[PDB]
Structures are given as C-alpha cells and as structure tokens.
Design an enzyme around this catalytic site. Structure first.
Site, short mmCIF file in Angstrom:
data_model
loop_
_atom_site.label_atom_id
_atom_site.label_comp_id
_atom_site.label_asym_id
_atom_site.label_seq_id
_atom_site.Cartn_x
_atom_site.Cartn_y
_atom_site.Cartn_z
CG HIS A 169 2.48 6.42 6.20
ND1 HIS A 169 2.06 5.98 6.82
CD2 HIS A 169 1.81 6.55 5.13
CE1 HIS A 169 1.08 6.55 7.46
NE2 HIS A 169 0.92 6.85 5.98
CD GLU A 185 -4.21 9.76 2.26
OE1 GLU A 185 -3.79 9.56 4.10
OE2 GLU A 185 -4.09 8.63 1.97
CG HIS A 193 0.31 10.87 6.97
ND1 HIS A 193 -0.24 9.96 6.21
CD2 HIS A 193 0.14 12.28 5.91
CE1 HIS A 193 -1.55 10.74 5.30
NE2 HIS A 193 -0.66 12.05 5.68
CB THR A 229 -6.27 8.04 5.49
OG1 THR A 229 -5.10 7.54 4.94
CG2 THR A 229 -6.26 9.03 6.47
CG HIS A 242 -1.41 -1.19 1.66
ND1 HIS A 242 -2.43 -1.22 0.77
CD2 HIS A 242 -1.52 -1.94 2.74
CE1 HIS A 242 -3.54 -2.97 0.69
NE2 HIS A 242 -3.09 -3.15 2.19
CG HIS A 270 -1.04 8.57 1.67
ND1 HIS A 270 -1.63 7.38 1.75
CD2 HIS A 270 -0.33 8.47 2.80
CE1 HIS A 270 -1.68 7.49 3.11
NE2 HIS A 270 -1.64 8.27 3.91
#
Ligand SMILES: Clc1ccc(OCc2nnn[nH]2)cc1Cl
Ligand code: NA
Ligand SMILES: [Zn+2]
Length: 256
Positions: A90, A102, A115, A194, A60, A92
């Site tokens: 991590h 996000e 994050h 999230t 992911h 996104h």
C-alpha cells in the site's frame, strides 16, 4: 481512527497507548548520523513467483493483496533472520507534492511512500507474527514526482473502480518488481506499524533511492475517498503519520 484533526495521529494514543512507545515509526532518517553496518548481509528481494489477488480500498489507503499461503514472494537477508513472506503493499501520500511520505530523510518529505509488507514465516500466520518484535519486515520506497513509473500504471488505472471505502477489484497477475528502484541500498531500524494498532513488530528497511512517478499518477491517488459510497466526499489525501521520536535507536546503513 483516521487522519483528520479530530481522529488523527495526535489522538491515537488514547486508544493505543503504545503510540508513545519506545520503537514507534516512522522516523526521520538523519543521513549524517546513520552508520554503515558491515555486518548486514546482502538483501534478497525474491518476487518472481508473486501472486497478486485483489486491490481493496479500506478507508485508510488502498491495499494490493497477495497469495501468501506458500513461499512465493519473499524478502530475506539484510538485517533479517529467516524468511519473510509478502502479504500486501500500500502507499501513503499527500495532498501536495511536497508531503506524503511517513519516513523523512534529513527532514525531507517525499510525495508518497510505498510499503511492501512481509511477515516472518517462523510464526506461521500474519496475526501471530504481529505479536512478535521481529514479526514483520516492511520495505519502504519513497516516491518523487517526475517521470512516470510504467510499473505503477496498472495500479493507477484500477483506482477508479475502488473509489470508496469497502470497494475491491480483481488484481491478478500484477508484478511488484515493477515498483522497485535500481538500487537496493537501504537504511534499517526496529520500529512499528504506522497506523493503529501501532504494534512494535516491524524491522524497517527503507530504500535510499526513490522511484519517480508522474504528476498525473499521484493525482489519481488523490481522487480516492476515505468515505464509503453514498457518504459525503472526503478525499483520501495526507494518510501519513509524521516522524516519531527515535529514542534509544540507531539507524544502520547498508552502504558506504
Ligand atoms: Cl497489512 C498492513 C496494511 C497497512 C498498514 O499501514 C500502516 C503501516 N504501514 N507500514 N507499517 N504500518 C500496515 C499493515 Cl501491517
Ligand atoms: Na526487532
Ligand atoms: Zn504503510
């Protein structure tokens, strides 16, 4: 679950009904509506004794994990009561530089979002913390494409060794202080994870100042794979959830 047309964010509610809940994340931060909260205490990011261990591709994102068996690296102050221990960070990110974050700021999407995840030590372990409304504090930091971020390059350079789902590598002696911007000005609101299970256990602290990373750095994020080794290649891009309804919430600013 994942981020494709057939298993992405519009599908998640069928297995995780809290996806349509009252304090979901991310959200759009309307800067004109967010209000200064003179009540917020100073934010304390204390990462000097941070002990990184490993970097993992979990299908992911990629996670850099820390030793959280003691109060080494902690987040305190701001909206928080008590002590929150850094467990991992991590990102996104997007397929293109104009999308990937996000949270959004006045509907603007950044190229990526970092994050740093922390759990409330009053609940003893991370698994217990995520069952509580004030269990986690996630520090969110926007990335924009411009000059390289020197403190990110050690991360970038190890991604070739964890290309596929399930791969991990040693990642000791990494200093997460190198990922922060100069200012700790922030917005804060109560929200959620999230990704599934989308638990409503997060106090969000989103920094106003983005960090810059280079085009070459984010391009290397985009060479990661969602798939495992030996499977058809699915580039790990656009692993972000879009903004969710703010509902009965106010976003507070730390700054005037
Ligand atoms: Cl440990 C962890 C790793 C990844 C992750 O991604 C979803 C997310 N990001 N910020 N809040 N939830 C969540 C968590 Cl709590
Ligand atoms: Na809360
Ligand atoms: Zn995240």
């Amino acid at each position: 679950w994942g981020y494709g047309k057939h298993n992405g964010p519009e599908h998640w509610h069928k297995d995780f009904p809290i996806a349509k809940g009252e304090r979901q994340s991310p959200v759009d931060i309307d800067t004109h509506t967010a209000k200064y909260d003179p009540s917020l205490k100073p934010l304390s990011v204390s990462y000097d004794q941070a002990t990184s261990l490993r970097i993992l591709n979990n299908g992911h994102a990629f996670n850099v994990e820390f030793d959280d068996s003691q109060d080494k690296a902690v987040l305190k102050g701001g909206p928080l009561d008590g002590t929150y221990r850094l467990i991992q960070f991590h990102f996104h990110w997007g397929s293109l530089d104009g999308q990937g974050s996000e949270h959004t700021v006045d509907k603007k999407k950044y190229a990526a979002e970092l994050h740093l995840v922390h759990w409330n030590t009053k609940y003893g372990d991370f698994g217990k913390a995520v069952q509580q409304p004030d269990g986690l504090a996630v520090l969110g930091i926007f990335l924009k494409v411009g000059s390289a971020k020197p403190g990110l390059q050690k991360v970038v350079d190890v991604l070739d060794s964890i290309k596929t789902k399930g791969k991990s590598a040693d990642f000791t002696n990494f200093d997460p202080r190198g990922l922060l911007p100069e200012s700790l000005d922030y917005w804060t609101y109560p929200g959620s994870l999230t990704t599934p299970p989308l638990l409503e256990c997060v106090t969000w602290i989103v920094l106003k100042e983005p960090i810059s990373v280079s085009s070459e750095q984010v391009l290397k994020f985009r060479k990661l794979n969602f798939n495992g080794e030996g499977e058809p290649e699915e580039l790990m891009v656009d692993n972000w959830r879009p903004a969710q309804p703010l509902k009965n919430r106010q976003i507070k600013a730390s700054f005037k």
